Design a binder for this molecule. Structure first.
Ligand SMILES: [Cl-]
Ligand SMILES: [Cl-]
Ligand SMILES: [Cl-]
Ligand SMILES: [Cl-]
Ligand SMILES: [Cl-]
Ligand SMILES: [Cl-]
Ligand SMILES: [Cl-]
Ligand SMILES: [Cl-]
Ligand SMILES: [Cl-]
Ligand SMILES: [Cl-]
Ligand SMILES: [Cl-]
Ligand SMILES: [Cl-]
Ligand SMILES: [Cl-]
Ligand SMILES: [Cl-]
Ligand SMILES: [Cl-]
Ligand SMILES: [Cl-]
Ligand SMILES: [Cl-]
Ligand SMILES: [Cl-]
Ligand SMILES: [Cl-]
Ligand SMILES: [Cl-]
Ligand SMILES: [Cl-]
Ligand SMILES: [Cl-]
Ligand SMILES: [Cl-]
Ligand SMILES: [Cl-]
Ligand SMILES: [Cl-]
Ligand SMILES: [Cl-]
Ligand SMILES: [Cl-]
Ligand SMILES: [Cl-]
Ligand SMILES: [Cl-]
Ligand SMILES: [Cl-]
Ligand SMILES: [Cl-]
Ligand SMILES: [Cl-]
Ligand SMILES: [Cl-]
Ligand SMILES: [Cl-]
Ligand SMILES: [Cl-]
Ligand SMILES: [Cl-]
Ligand SMILES: [Cl-]
Ligand SMILES: [Fe+3]
Ligand SMILES: [Fe+3]
Ligand SMILES: [Fe+3]
Ligand SMILES: [Fe+3]
Ligand SMILES: [Fe+3]
Ligand SMILES: [Fe+3]
Ligand SMILES: [Fe+3]
Ligand SMILES: [Fe+3]
Ligand SMILES: [Fe+3]
Ligand SMILES: [Fe+3]
Ligand SMILES: [Fe+3]
Ligand SMILES: [Fe+3]
Ligand SMILES: [Fe+3]
Ligand SMILES: [Fe+3]
Ligand SMILES: [Fe+3]
Ligand SMILES: [Fe+3]
Ligand SMILES: [Fe+3]
Ligand SMILES: [Mg+2]
Ligand SMILES: [Mg+2]
Ligand SMILES: [Mg+2]
Ligand SMILES: [Mg+2]
Ligand SMILES: [Mg+2]
Ligand SMILES: [Mg+2]
Ligand SMILES: [Mg+2]
Ligand SMILES: [Mg+2]
Ligand SMILES: [Mg+2]
Ligand SMILES: [Mg+2]
Ligand SMILES: [Mg+2]
Ligand SMILES: [Mg+2]
Ligand SMILES: [Mg+2]
Ligand SMILES: [Mg+2]
Ligand SMILES: [Mg+2]
Ligand SMILES: [Mg+2]
Ligand SMILES: [Mg+2]
Ligand SMILES: [Mg+2]
Ligand SMILES: [Mg+2]
Ligand SMILES: [Mg+2]
Ligand SMILES: [Mg+2]
Ligand SMILES: [Mg+2]
Ligand SMILES: [Mg+2]
Ligand SMILES: [Mg+2]
Ligand SMILES: [Mg+2]
Ligand SMILES: [Mg+2]
Lengths: 173, 173, 173, 173
């Protein structure tokens, strides 16, 4: 019954809250990858910093959904942020493969939310997803795929020299 | 039969003209609010200037529809701009409540136009509304709602000190 | 068995992981307060932004513990970040009271960790807490206490004008 | 019987002199590593310069203890600076392993000195060690550990290409 609410279905409000949680979950998974690559027995600092940046970007995605919810007159409802699926991430290839799957999971949830918004005839929510989320996902999925191709080319997981070279030439210094 | 016309339904052309009129109507209502708050026996100049700015923005919305109509090969058809519903606006709370309802009326018309454009399979018109109109409405509706909440907190309509404080701290100097 | 590990007790490593979780929990609680004050029916934007900033600072506290853990040769172990205790925060006074208690809870955990580090004769961990955490807590606790005193002076919770004045004069614009 | 002396135990004064000697010993060992990597039949100049810098930093650590001794009213007593344990350092991996052990030996001596200062209730000496020495050690130990992990990844000692790559991408140009 918010005074600002107009053309905003309860189902979409709830799905936005669930999407918010998933963004926070993604942030936390990336934070775990950062910490792993920062370990003294892993020590791939450019890879670590790549994942730290990914983590911060996911938190920005989450905060943008909070703001959106309030703009439409919905109510933010938070749930636990589940810990990541793994405590250690193997190596750069395994981590990038997990990152690819994570970004595709997030993308599928965004696409599902777009379908719901379409079904409920909510063009503002459609526009928001298209303008602020969907292209970011396609771009990041492509970037991570490109990385995986190069890690395989470099002989991961077996080729430690390849892994070193990737950290020194493929990710930001 | 315009040489530029392509995928532009007569119904959408007509609805764009009606939307243009509504934007002009909204501009005129805001102009009335400006004049009211500029009265010597009302004298809330920051509130007055807020509504003057709202009025100018609505005229910009109208002109953008005129340009759009011509870009698609439709023909601008003007009708009378009806005078506002009231000659005096009571106080800042009453005016903001009327502004909220006005912005929601405009928003509903834009949403209805988007539905029509969708029905007629006009993605250019959909994009135009989503990119140039729908988010502006959500933003302004939220801003005015926020103002109303604060005016109520400040004890409007009875609390004149509250009304003074709002004009001096909530709206641009 | 990390090659860098020296004078770092398993108990301290575990307690650092638990402290990390608590920092993340604090961040999430502050994020909830931000979202609440950003609601159209609450609409205290300077208060909202204060809590958003608090939330970001807690995430910085968490990341610093992750880095610390790795520097000492411990291993970051993550757990679920529990959702905040409340879904809505009442008003500025109730939220500030909850913030005070949260900062004191965090402070007690830091003091307990310092006691453990002292018991295990770990001066590096003692220094880290004293140089990076303990004074921040005292400062923030004092700031929030000062705010609460002023909110009470301004007649919270009943005095809406007082609450408005606080948002406009006590917290950053 | 120095006029400035206050709360400075004879045991701490003596231990500071022994610590000074150890800093000088560490400097000399690093100087030997510099000279080794500068050999025409070793020729890893970035590695050589890394160790030269390490050597200079250890001399700075020593001089700071001399100044400290005098500030407290103790008397600097010098002993021979023993030559390093080896005349040649094998390769980058062997040298980094020796550097890690050296930094941990220095760290243990600093921790032992902190324990003594604690036992003698000398908070100024505790603060000095915590503020000027202990974090430097943790940082350098982590850095060298990280290097060792990367040298192993690069196939040291057998992989000469790996050793070349490390010198060109892991240590300052
Ligand atoms: Cl609705
Ligand atoms: Cl929900
Ligand atoms: Cl996984
Ligand atoms: Cl695992
Ligand atoms: Cl996933
Ligand atoms: Cl959905
Ligand atoms: Cl995007
Ligand atoms: Cl691109
Ligand atoms: Cl690439
Ligand atoms: Cl046509
Ligand atoms: Cl018409
Ligand atoms: Cl009216
Ligand atoms: Cl009237
Ligand atoms: Cl209306
Ligand atoms: Cl229509
Ligand atoms: Cl817009
Ligand atoms: Cl906005
Ligand atoms: Cl406001
Ligand atoms: Cl240990
Ligand atoms: Cl743990
Ligand atoms: Cl609570
Ligand atoms: Cl609640
Ligand atoms: Cl608490
Ligand atoms: Cl503890
Ligand atoms: Cl601090
Ligand atoms: Cl202070
Ligand atoms: Cl204050
Ligand atoms: Cl005032
Ligand atoms: Cl003395
Ligand atoms: Cl001596
Ligand atoms: Cl040796
Ligand atoms: Cl030798
Ligand atoms: Cl040694
Ligand atoms: Cl000692
Ligand atoms: Cl230090
Ligand atoms: Cl560091
Ligand atoms: Cl490294
Ligand atoms: Fe980025
Ligand atoms: Fe995301
Ligand atoms: Fe992402
Ligand atoms: Fe990205
Ligand atoms: Fe404006
Ligand atoms: Fe308009
Ligand atoms: Fe408008
Ligand atoms: Fe506007
Ligand atoms: Fe701050
Ligand atoms: Fe904290
Ligand atoms: Fe805090
Ligand atoms: Fe703070
Ligand atoms: Fe004032
Ligand atoms: Fe240096
Ligand atoms: Fe040293
Ligand atoms: Fe050193
Ligand atoms: Fe150093
Ligand atoms: Mg209401
Ligand atoms: Mg609902
Ligand atoms: Mg979920
Ligand atoms: Mg679980
Ligand atoms: Mg569309
Ligand atoms: Mg679009
Ligand atoms: Mg785009
Ligand atoms: Mg690319
Ligand atoms: Mg013609
Ligand atoms: Mg027609
Ligand atoms: Mg009309
Ligand atoms: Mg009439
Ligand atoms: Mg837009
Ligand atoms: Mg605002
Ligand atoms: Mg090992
Ligand atoms: Mg343990
Ligand atoms: Mg806990
Ligand atoms: Mg629970
Ligand atoms: Mg301090
Ligand atoms: Mg103060
Ligand atoms: Mg004398
Ligand atoms: Mg003596
Ligand atoms: Mg000695
Ligand atoms: Mg000898
Ligand atoms: Mg320090
Ligand atoms: Mg490093």
């Amino acid at each position: 019954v918010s005074q600002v609410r107009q053309n905003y279905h309860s189902d979409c409000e709830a799905a936005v809250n669930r999407m918010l949680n998933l963004e926070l979950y993604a942030s936390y998974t990336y934070s775990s990858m950062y910490a792993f690559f920062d370990r003294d027995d892993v020590a791939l600092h450019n890879v670590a910093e790549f994942f730290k940046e990914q983590s911060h970007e996911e938190r920005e995605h989450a905060e943008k959904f909070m703001k959106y919810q309030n703009k439409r007159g919905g109510r933010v409802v938070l749930q636990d942020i589940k810990k990541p699926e793994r405590d250690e991430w193997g190596n750069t290839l395994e981590a990038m493969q997990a990152a690819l799957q994570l970004e595709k999971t997030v993308n599928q949830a965004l696409l599902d939310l777009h379908k719901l918004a379409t079904d409920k005839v909510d063009p503002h929510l459609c526009d928001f997803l298209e303008s602020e989320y969907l292209e970011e996902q396609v771009k990041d999925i492509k970037r991570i795929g490109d990385f995986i191709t190069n890690l395989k080319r470099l002989g991961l997981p077996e080729n430690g020299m390849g892994e070193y070279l990737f950290d020194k030439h493929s990710v930001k210094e």
